[PDB]
Design a protein around this ligand. Structure first.
Ligand SMILES: CC(C)(O)[C@@H]1CCN(c2cc(-n3ncc4ccc([C@]5(C#N)CC56CC6)cc43)ncn2)C1
Length: 260
């Protein structure tokens, strides 16, 4: 089979709607999101067109073939952050810091254009030729600010180990602290090679242990005091008490010089 001049070589990953494939021309290699069948694809295309930043995946354009929609994006040659996390170990702290600084740069950019990602996790954080982080998958992205006016979110979505606790508890909630929370779980995964809990709920023992400051337990015991102090400010239950990105940028570990 062929679409204009493209050949489907390898499945790069799956999302809530459709599949992302590695497409080779006749010999340019690109990433194509193939979606069957409406209100959501019009929204995703719209958000994808607004994006212009070094830490956000580049959108090439879109083609329609009846019921099938093709979304063309720049191929992340370095693959995903997920495959740089050694299970039970994580990665060297200077590499985790650099990826965290790049994650903050991409999230400030999105929030600045009033877009919330809503599914930040290592499979959605890709790497270019020079290991520069790029935030991908905008199928769950939505507008939280328009005409300088904030809109609260009221839809439950994301990935349970990464979702903020207010998302499971409150009818309506602010967008930005939810994305901040998921960034904190990503930081935990980079420094410990393990996710801290199945979900941030009272029925989850590991979440209860964190709230009781049992930081002598895994994954926290694998993390050095300085990044752990940052995680203590991010992984705060009350979203109004949770650290904001301007203040993460002032954190001691965020500003620590690191090498080797
Ligand atoms: C062949 C090569 C160069 O060796 C490498 C081998 C692993 N590779 C990749 C590349 C990607 N890319 N690249 C661009 C791109 C855009 C969107 C998405 C996503 C969405 N939506 C997150 C999700 C669902 C996958 C992925 C993308 N995803 C994984 N691995 C490429």
């Amino acid at each position: 089979p062929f679409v204009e001049d493209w050949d489907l070589v390898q499945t790069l990953g799956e999302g809530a709607y459709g599949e992302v494939q590695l497409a080779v021309n006749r010999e340019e290699a690109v990433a194509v999101k193939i979606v069957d069948m409406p209100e959501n694809i019009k929204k995703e295309i719209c958000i994808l067109k607004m994006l212009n930043h070094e830490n956000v995946i580049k959108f090439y354009g879109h083609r329609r073939e009846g019921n099938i929609q093709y979304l063309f994006m720049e191929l992340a040659s370095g693959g995903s952050l997920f495959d740089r996390i050694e299970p039970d170990i994580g990665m060297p702290e200077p590499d985790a810091q650099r990826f965290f600084h790049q994650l903050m740069a991409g999230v400030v950019y999105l929030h600045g254009i009033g877009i919330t990602h809503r599914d930040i996790k290592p499979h959605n954080l890709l790497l270019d030729e020079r290991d520069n982080l790029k935030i991908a998958d905008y199928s769950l992205a939505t507008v939280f600010r328009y005409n300088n006016r904030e809109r609260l979110l009221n839809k439950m979505c994301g990935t349970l180990p990464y979702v903020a606790p207010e998302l499971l508890k409150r009818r309506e909630f602010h967008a930005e602290p939810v994305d901040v929370w998921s960034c904190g779980i990503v930081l935990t995964a980079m420094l410990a090679g393990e996710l801290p809990w199945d979900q941030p709920s009272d029925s989850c023992q590991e979440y209860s242990d964190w709230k009781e400051k049992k930081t002598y337990l895994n994954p926290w015991k694998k993390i050095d005091s300085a990044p752990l102090a940052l995680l203590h400010k991010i992984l705060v239950e009350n979203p109004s008490a949770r650290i904001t990105i301007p203040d993460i940028k002032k954190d001691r570990w965020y500003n620590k010089p690191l090498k080797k």
